[PDB]
Design a protein around this ligand. Structure first.
Ligand SMILES: CC(C)Nc1cc(-n2c3c(c4c2CC(C)(C)CC4=O)CCN(C)C3)cc2c1C(=O)NCC2
Length: 209
């Protein structure tokens, strides 16, 4: 079954601002999502030091970038801690509420959209380039879930019926028609080198056959 939820008022406001504001420096979405993945990887790595059985769901700690020109999708796969049903519906939304408020106040005070990460709401920069975002996730303590939103004030959460992941998160960016440059090998390499060169996990770009 598919459950539909309204985003927190502040989050819905941020999403509308990200989608409607004229801002050409859209490439920052990739460093924001890579940073989210890197943070999830740090979390599982740290937890595994006191409980090694937390890595029974996969020992490899990495990030994979998968562009798909046919489907017009850019997929970011990590083997991080993953997210529970509570994280997707309540927890992360509650955490994001305060940062979203602070970021929108900062934007009114002179700050630019690239500073989104300093407020811990960088995930939402995915909407600079994507018309729809699908998040497939698996945490050791819960089932595999699929979160999805095309903005408009709502998101859906369902138990994922697809291919089992083991542990981690897949962020599927259903790109806007004019944002296909982020599917080009050369462009992705340039973004990773400029903004994510010092990420402490291997970042593998999957080249299209
Ligand atoms: C284990 C938490 C910290 N990893 C993540 C958390 C988010 N994330 C975050 C936020 C949100 C999301 C994803 C979302 C779909 C739940 C929406 C949201 O508000 C707000 C606060 N941010 C600090 C993080 C996104 C991702 C991840 C992840 O594991 N991999 C990549 C995608």
């Amino acid at each position: 079954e598919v459950e539909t939820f309204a985003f927190q008022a502040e989050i819905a406001q941020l999403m509308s601002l990200i989608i409607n504001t004229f801002y050409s420096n859209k490439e920052i979405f990739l460093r924001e999502l890579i940073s989210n993945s890197s943070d999830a990887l740090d979390k599982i790595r740290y937890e595994s030091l006191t409980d090694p059985s937390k890595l029974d769901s996969g020992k490899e700690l990495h990030i994979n970038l998968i562009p798909n020109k046919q489907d017009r999708t850019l997929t970011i796969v990590d083997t991080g801690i993953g997210m529970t049903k509570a994280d997707l519906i309540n927890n992360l939304g509650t955490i994001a509420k305060s940062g979203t408020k602070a970021f929108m106040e900062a934007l009114q005070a002179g700050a630019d959209i690239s500073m989104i990460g300093q407020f811990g709401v960088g995930f939402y920069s995915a909407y600079l380039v994507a018309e729809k975002v699908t998040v497939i996730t698996k945490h050791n303590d819960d089932e595999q879930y699929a979160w999805e939103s095309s903005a408009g004030g709502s998101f859906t959460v369902r138990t994922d019926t697809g291919e089992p992941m083991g542990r981690g998160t897949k962020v599927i960016l259903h790109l806007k028609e004019d944002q296909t440059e982020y599917l080009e090998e050369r462009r992705i390499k340039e973004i990773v080198k400029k903004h994510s060169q010092f990420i402490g996990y291997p970042i593998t770009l999957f080249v299209e056959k």
